[PDB]
Scaffold this motif. Structure first.
Motif, PDB file in Angstrom:
ATOM      1  N   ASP A   1     -12.470   4.305   3.818  1.00 56.61           N
ATOM      2  CA  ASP A   1     -11.419   4.030   2.831  1.00 56.61           C
ATOM      3  C   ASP A   1     -12.009   3.439   1.566  1.00 56.61           C
ATOM      4  O   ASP A   1     -11.563   3.736   0.455  1.00 56.61           O
TER       5      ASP A   1
ATOM      6  N   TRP B   1      -7.121   0.108   3.077  1.00 57.11           N
ATOM      7  CA  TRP B   1      -6.323   1.248   2.633  1.00 57.11           C
ATOM      8  C   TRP B   1      -5.480   0.884   1.417  1.00 57.11           C
ATOM      9  O   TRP B   1      -5.332   1.698   0.504  1.00 57.11           O
ATOM     10  N   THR B   2      -4.926  -0.334   1.365  1.00 59.19           N
ATOM     11  CA  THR B   2      -4.045  -0.654   0.242  1.00 59.19           C
ATOM     12  C   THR B   2      -4.840  -0.712  -1.058  1.00 59.19           C
ATOM     13  O   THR B   2      -4.419  -0.121  -2.063  1.00 59.19           O
TER      14      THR B   2
ATOM     15  N   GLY C   1       0.806  -1.211   0.000  1.00 58.87           N
ATOM     16  CA  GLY C   1       0.000   0.000   0.000  1.00 58.87           C
ATOM     17  C   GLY C   1       0.841   1.263   0.000  1.00 58.87           C
ATOM     18  O   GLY C   1       0.556   2.198  -0.747  1.00 58.87           O
ATOM     19  N   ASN C   2       1.924   1.292   0.809  1.00 57.32           N
ATOM     20  CA  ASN C   2       2.838   2.427   0.750  1.00 57.32           C
ATOM     21  C   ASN C   2       3.436   2.627  -0.645  1.00 57.32           C
ATOM     22  O   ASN C   2       3.407   3.739  -1.180  1.00 57.32           O
TER      23      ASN C   2
ATOM     24  N   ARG D   1       2.065   2.341  -8.439  1.00 59.04           N
ATOM     25  CA  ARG D   1       0.790   1.663  -8.317  1.00 59.04           C
ATOM     26  C   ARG D   1       0.655   0.571  -9.375  1.00 59.04           C
ATOM     27  O   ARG D   1       0.274  -0.569  -9.062  1.00 59.04           O
TER      28      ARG D   1
ATOM     29  N   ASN E   1      -5.467   2.712  -2.354  1.00 58.45           N
ATOM     30  CA  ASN E   1      -4.277   3.244  -3.026  1.00 58.45           C
ATOM     31  C   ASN E   1      -4.104   2.625  -4.402  1.00 58.45           C
ATOM     32  O   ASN E   1      -3.501   3.252  -5.275  1.00 58.45           O
TER      33      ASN E   1
ATOM     34  N   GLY F   1       0.767   3.779  -3.112  1.00 59.91           N
ATOM     35  CA  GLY F   1       0.339   5.145  -2.897  1.00 59.91           C
ATOM     36  C   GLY F   1       1.374   6.175  -3.271  1.00 59.91           C
ATOM     37  O   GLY F   1       1.053   7.366  -3.317  1.00 59.91           O
TER      38      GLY F   1
ATOM     39  N   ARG G   1      -6.343   4.777  -6.667  1.00 62.78           N
ATOM     40  CA  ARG G   1      -6.052   6.193  -6.591  1.00 62.78           C
ATOM     41  C   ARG G   1      -5.151   6.617  -7.743  1.00 62.78           C
ATOM     42  O   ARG G   1      -4.565   5.798  -8.467  1.00 62.78           O
ATOM     43  N   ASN G   2      -5.187   7.926  -7.997  1.00 60.06           N
ATOM     44  CA  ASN G   2      -4.288   8.620  -8.914  1.00 60.06           C
ATOM     45  C   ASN G   2      -4.623   8.375 -10.366  1.00 60.06           C
ATOM     46  O   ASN G   2      -5.278   7.385 -10.688  1.00 60.06           O
TER      47      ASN G   2
ATOM     48  N   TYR H   1     -12.342   7.650  -6.162  1.00 62.49           N
ATOM     49  CA  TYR H   1     -11.253   7.669  -7.141  1.00 62.49           C
ATOM     50  C   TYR H   1     -11.717   7.030  -8.446  1.00 62.49           C
ATOM     51  O   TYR H   1     -11.515   7.568  -9.540  1.00 62.49           O
TER      52      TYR H   1
END
Lengths: 422, 419
Positions: free
Chosen positions: B192, B153-154, B109-110, B119, B157, B113, B160-161, B199
């Protein structure tokens, strides 16, 4: 109108008829519900709008064309690329110098929208030379001469030039933009201040060099001033920026401390907004990871009890932040600083979290307890600490951690027990 | 230097003790000298440790050291990724130990993100399927709260973006789990998951349509009414995005009950909720006439008048759009009703704003109302109403040649109805 009626109006010699067609274009494109962007692009109108941007004798067509191009550029990434490949950025730049405030403002708005679309479009805006004319608009002696809305638009556009990563903003552009931002940070409009604080938070979220460029401006005191603003839209970015700065070097942290940031944390750590509370405890965790004299200033400002209370009654995500605050404290702190922490009642809430499922947190708490016991060894008072841990049921919690389902936690709790409870 | 030596020791425990020390050394995000750590070549050592199935602690410790490194500059994350951490972490997801899986989930996830490129690397190396298999269990309440929150959360992510948006196939794999997660009771998981959908819904209509076809919109709408702001905010973003799509996509939202919630959203003390809800409403009044009619049927026009009259300027601007979209696509009867609900005076008072775009949009709204008046033969009655509330004075104030667009627009209205 239809794509045919607009194309006929735009291919007309009657400039007034062209204006009407572009206005219709504006009305079809300004709806955020099904703007016919794809067919308008397939019609070849992008180059037509770009050309209209240069019609200095007809400000309305410039304004309307700029609005149409921005609406197109606010769609998919390919549509943004179509506007940029159409030459829109230099044409927008040429509009920045218009003697008509609303025309330059439309150009500012258009350029900020392109830049906010993402890092690649931001760098294109920078690459084609937007920063210089944008900043020249604020080169005036008194910023109160500029209208509010005009200033907010410019501030937002600059913020967008500071925003986003992968890549981060070009070094040269940041150097050119920073002085204007620090000045805006002394303006009295809340929206300008919020946007500027957000701009600086973006700049300080990055390599150390960036943090260094920000702190060197001497703006940290003003950030600290805005850390106490009543407006939450100002405090939130100010706190993030300061939080980012204290992730840097011990000196950069000292710059934050010297500005008086710690004096504001009594309110921040009890702020009813859980996000401010978490961000405040995050920022303190990075302070207590500094030097011992910096930990001492945290103590001097009466901040340790707030940390204890946070650990005891806050939500789990904020409690995790507080666990790191306490562990960093115990890891770098002096013996007397650790006794004080135990004198603040850290043991009991610290032990209560040992029922959490988070392996990382469990292991971090056991490390903190180990550091507390080390301070006790140096004083020879480990016995009272051991009983104290047992008094509040901490030892039972530690023994509960001796479960073979989790070997890391089993071994961690077993080592602690062998050294201090055996 | 001493740390590298411990990592290159033949004794298993000594290597464990070095990487654990490294974890603790890296635990603190206070100016760690990673540049030399990359020069020393410790990243590939950690990655190898993740494959040591027989030594769970070493896997745990190294996972922690690599994720800490991956949470800095792009070059540090890049070094972690080129080190083969991403595949290593994916292999770690299948661990029979829950606390090891979670560490990998957190590391992925880090990395994911950090940006769209990483990603997509996380997806490209095959992380989606094993991540989802962890949530394929029949009862998500059986999983620990911290473990599910990390997984959720992962996933968000991974949704996302943009530039580029996530790959279509990965989004179609992920969406059915997002559906099931939105029926979980944990507020953080819900938040989340709503963010992830917001997204996914922030894009072209085909992306919107991927979301809508899952059947999830009625559950989103239910969450629009949650007491937790950290849930309402993303749910509302999601619904607002979906109503920027087709008329049909907008009807899915209306049919899921959304409009019954807008009396609360439009009067919500959080001014951001008011703004996003008025934004959302403006996109609904930009829809077909039967949709405008549903807005009317759900009692919302008085709420929109109140917002236009008393809300902050940012929200007022969205209300201006909502009104102009209403007057642009509505019937004569819908527009009469708008006037009956009191729209004229609050609309005219905003003609003192300095925003040229808003000014032209308001005048368009006035022209649209006047067109309805023409069809009814009541243009004089409308003019009187505009003149009575000081609207005409506000229109005349716009007769300034310093702004030719506003002058021309305001001149047209004056000549046509105020001669």
């Amino acid at each position: 109108w239809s794509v045919d009626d607009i194309v006929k109006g735009i291919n007309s010699s009657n400039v007034e008829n062209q204006l009407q067609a572009t206005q219709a274009a504006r009305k079809l494109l300004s709806r955020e519900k099904q703007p016919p962007i794809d067919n308008i692009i397939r019609a070849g109108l992008i180059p037509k709008f770009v050309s209209f941007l240069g019609r200095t004798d007809c400000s309305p067509i410039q304004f309307e064309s700029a609005w149409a191009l921005t609406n197109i550029a606010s769609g998919t990434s390919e549509q943004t690329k179509a506007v940029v490949d159409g030459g829109a950025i230099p044409a927008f730049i040429s509009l920045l110098a218009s003697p008509h405030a609303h025309i330059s403002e439309q150009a500012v708005w258009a350029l900020g929208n392109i830049a906010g679309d993402g890092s690649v479009f931001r760098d294109l805006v920078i690459k084609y030379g937007a920063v210089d004319p944008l900043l020249a608009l604020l080169a005036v002696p008194d910023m109160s001469s500029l209208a509010c809305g005009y200033l907010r638009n410019l501030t937002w556009t600059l913020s967008n030039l500071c925003r986003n990563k992968n890549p981060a903003p070009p070094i040269d552009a940041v150097e050119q933009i920073l002085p204007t931002l620090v000045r805006l940070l002394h303006h009295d409009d809340p929206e300008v201040l919020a946007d500027t604080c957000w701009a600086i938070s973006y700049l300080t979220d990055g390599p150390n060099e960036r943090i260094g460029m920000v702190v060197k401006t001497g703006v940290v005191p003003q950030l600290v001033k805005l850390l106490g603003a009543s407006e939450l839209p100002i405090v939130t970015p100010a706190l993030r920026a300061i939080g980012n700065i204290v992730t840097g070097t011990d000196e950069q942290t000292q710059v934050v401390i010297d500005a008086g940031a710690l004096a504001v944390f009594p309110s921040l750590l009890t702020n009813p907004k859980t996000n401010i509370q978490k961000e405040a405890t995050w920022t303190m965790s990075n302070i207590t990871a500094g030097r011992q004299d910096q930990i001492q200033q945290v103590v001097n400002h009466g901040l340790v009890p707030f940390l204890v209370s946070v650990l005891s009654k806050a939500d789990f995500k904020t409690q995790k932040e507080a666990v790191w605050a306490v562990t960093n404290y115990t890891s770098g702190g002096t013996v007397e600083q650790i006794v004080y922490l135990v004198h603040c009642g850290i043991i009991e809430p610290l032990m209560n979290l040992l029922t959490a499922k988070d392996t990382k947190i469990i292991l971090v708490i056991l490390d903190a307890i180990s550091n507390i016991f080390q301070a006790a060894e140096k004083l020879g008072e480990t016995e009272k600490l051991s009983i104290m841990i047992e008094e509040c049921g901490g030892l039972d919690k530690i023994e509960a951690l001796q479960n073979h389902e989790n070997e890391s936690v089993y071994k961690a709790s077993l080592s602690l027990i062998e050294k201090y409870f055996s």
